[PDB]
């Protein structure tokens, strides 16, 4: 009976909660109390990247740590030479409501998507001099909110149809559809080894998925409301989430629980972007109050603020060699920090 | 102090900047409008009429471009989105106006429509965004209340103790009953509006049948008023 199934679900959920309660023998604070506080970090706007007409929702660093793709709601992707602030490419988009972008690890492609429900893929390195649309991937019902290239032929898209998908770029069709969320999936972070990935939705729950077997492997809870950003710790055995309940939270896949929560009483805006440094000792979060906060992830004290932006910080990305951090906001500007 | 290839790279960047300025010059000259409504609300027919008079399977948004009096408008409506709205609505907190088409010839889903309008009005991101609500399908409502089969008073008890405000203007000449009922619905929506307007944003009621060709001019006039208000706030004239 339906009552029987519901009772079984409650029983298994209680069993999971009990196992999680048993496994938590010490807080990360209790063990991290030993670690010396990082200290205040002052990061300065080394470069300011002007040229976007409207607000920015997305940016992705290149694996060469110098090029930079940025997505604005005016209908542009701009590829910056971050060292010299030159504009390398200016890619006009077919739908202006872009709200994600990715930069292929090889550097031959960038992706973008938004309210059009499409993940368009752009070919940067053509024999002709221009940047052309390589493929348009269709099949999601809700909007696209994040995309991340696994390699030059496989991309993973999260959507607001409660579904993340894995695509074959050569043969447009989907290869795996990841179902199990009950709200809009907002962010997405591929693991370093690219065999797994996590996605946070609008149901306050995040899930570690399996790219090859196609099935959700874990589910994590603890947030009070919908999750806006997610990112892997450089280890690959953890991830941090920022949500509209004004908190960041650090889950761990092996313990399958929550480790620490990054919150302050005076901060009531929702986190919009989360990214780590190389060591993982600094958790950088972009908030709605126009400032990105810097959190010492091991002990959850505020270590830095980067209040240069006027309007809300929508995107935030740390480069692969850890040299710089870039922040894009709704004031049409990108800021590179050291 | 920098090599010749860097001269040419800087020249390339400068041409890109010039193109970006040429794009800004037209980005400031177009106004963005978000269209909202329900399945029974005739907003699709409104879009069709606006496209016809002025100026692909699961695509999630339909941008319609129209102009009037040499001013360019871009009206966007979500086509393949889900029922949830609290996230992809944060993307529209800088549009000129929000057009909310409601079908007022149901009496049944109408309370759901008021709930939706209230959810839109009080949204933490849609402040300072005026709403242009279109009470759609008025002639259907007129005929359906001439029929008299469905009593409005049972769906809404307060309609019995209601009378037409003095500010009415029935132009063609119709039954005072239809005017009283339609102004009652308009006044329900306006009560929801003025409950928390606080002068930051406004609501512009209209009586619209999707066959009407004056919809675009109504949007234009309301947008002109909204721009005038934000300029009065901006040039510090108020």
């Amino acid at each position, epitope marked *: 009976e339906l009552d029987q199934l519901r009772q079984e679900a409650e029983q298994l959920k209680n069993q999971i909660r009990d196992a999680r309660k048993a496994c938590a023998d010490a807080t990360l604070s209790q063990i991290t109390n030993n670690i010396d506080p990082v200290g205040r970090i002052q990061m300065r706007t080394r470069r300011t990247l002007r040229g976007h007409l409207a607000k920015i929702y997305a940016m992705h660093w290149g694996t060469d740590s110098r090029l930079l793709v940025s997505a604005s709601q005016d209908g542009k992707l701009i590829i910056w030479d971050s060292y010299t602030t030159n504009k390398v490419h200016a890619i006009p988009l077919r739908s202006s409501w872009v709200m994600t972008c990715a930069y292929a690890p090889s550097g031959n492609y960038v992706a973008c998507g938004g309210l059009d429900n499409i993940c368009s893929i752009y070919n940067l390195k053509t*024999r002709e001099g221009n940047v052309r649309v390589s493929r348009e991937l269709a099949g999601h019902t809700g909007y696209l909110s994040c995309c991340r290239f696994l390699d030059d032929n496989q991309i993973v898209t999260s959507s607001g149809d409660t579904t993340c998908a894995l695509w074959d770029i050569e043969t447009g069709q989907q290869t795996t559809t990841f179902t199990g969320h009950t709200g809009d999936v907002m962010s997405l972070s591929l693991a370093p080894d690219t065999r797994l990935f996590v996605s946070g939705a609008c149901d306050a729950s995040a899930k570690l998925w399996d790219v090859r077997e196609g099935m959700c492997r874990q589910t994590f809870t603890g947030h009070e409301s919908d999750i806006n950003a997610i990112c892997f710790f450089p280890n690959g055995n953890a991830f941090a989430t920022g949500s509209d309940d004004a908190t960041c939270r650090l889950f761990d896949l092996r313990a399958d629980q929550e480790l620490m929560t990054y919150s302050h009483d005076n901060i009531i805006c929702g986190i919009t972007s989360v990214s780590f440094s190389k060591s993982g000792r600094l958790l950088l979060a972009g908030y709605d109050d126009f400032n990105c906060n810097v959190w010492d992830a091991l002990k959850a004290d505020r270590a830095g603020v980067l209040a240069g932006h006027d309007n809300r910080v929508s995107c935030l990305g740390v480069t692969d060699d850890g040299m710089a951090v870039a922040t894009g906001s709704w004031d049409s500007f990108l800021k590179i920090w050291n | 102090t920098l090599s010749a290839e860097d001269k040419a790279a800087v020249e390339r960047s400068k041409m890109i900047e010039k193109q970006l300025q040429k794009d800004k010059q037209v980005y400031r000259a177009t106004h963005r409008l978000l269209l909202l409504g329900a399945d029974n609300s005739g907003k699709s027919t409104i879009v069709k009429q606006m496209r016809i008079y002025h100026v692909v399977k699961t695509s999630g948004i339909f941008e319609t471009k129209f102009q009037v009096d040499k001013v360019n408008f871009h009206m966007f409506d979500v086509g393949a989105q889900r029922d949830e709205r609290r996230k992809w609505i944060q993307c529209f907190n800088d549009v000129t106006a929000i057009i909310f088409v409601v079908d007022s010839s149901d009496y049944n889903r109408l309370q759901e429509a008021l709930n939706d309008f209230k959810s839109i009005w009080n949204n933490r991101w849609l402040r300072t965004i005026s709403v242009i609500l279109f009470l759609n399908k008025q002639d259907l409502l007129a005929e359906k209340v001439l029929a008299g089969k469905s009593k409005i008073e049972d769906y809404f008890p307060e309609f019995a103790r209601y009378t037409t405000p003095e500010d009415a203007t029935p132009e063609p000449g119709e039954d005072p009953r239809v005017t009283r009922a339609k102004y009652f619905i308009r006044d329900e929506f306006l009560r929801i509006s003025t409950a928390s307007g606080d002068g930051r944003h406004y609501c512009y009621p209209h009586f619209t049948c999707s066959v009407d060709t004056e919809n675009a001019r109504r949007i234009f006039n309301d947008c002109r008023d909204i721009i005038q208000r934000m300029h009065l706030r901006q040039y510090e004239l108020l």
Partner: single-chain antibody
Amino acid sequence: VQLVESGGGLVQPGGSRKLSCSASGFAFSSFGMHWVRQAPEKGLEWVAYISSGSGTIYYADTVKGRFTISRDDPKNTLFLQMTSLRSEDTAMYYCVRSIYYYGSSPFDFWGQGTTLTVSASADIVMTQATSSVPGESVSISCRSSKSLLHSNGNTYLYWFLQRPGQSPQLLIYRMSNLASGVPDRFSGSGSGTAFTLTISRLEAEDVGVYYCMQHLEYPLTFGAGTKLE
């Protein structure tokens, strides 16, 4: 990509000619294009240069007022105007394509060339001392006067291979980067003044004349050429 060029022939001295370079198959307006010439039996020599947007124009010291370079982007052609032709202007003129941004490969395409016949300083000099040399390994060398390594970290040295019957093709740009389409056999190295190009295993299609070029500062001087037989 293809660059077909025309407008050359027998010319009486003191006359004038206008060369053209009709381009098809690439975004012409975003490429800065050069004219390079070579005397019937000598090495290549740079002539002029016009930039994207037509804002930067350079000329050789030997054509500084005699010549005039101009482009027509909508018509997608490149022109070179020549006045008061002398007997040192007998050469085949090449149309070269070059785009400049981070990571780009300038001089990556060369046109087939046009022949022009005329009837009867403080710039970097690069010398290829060797003038001649299947399955073996060859190590064509090169030398320069001023150091080519810039403060950027780049070493603006280019390698071109001219097969016995056609136009040069780019093999290595900025001393280390193999161009698109060149096999993995070719590789380049250097230090700032002395450079070398390595072919790991020859083939019957690797025979020709190897030319070097510097892009550090205009004019672009080339080098005599190394022959493989």
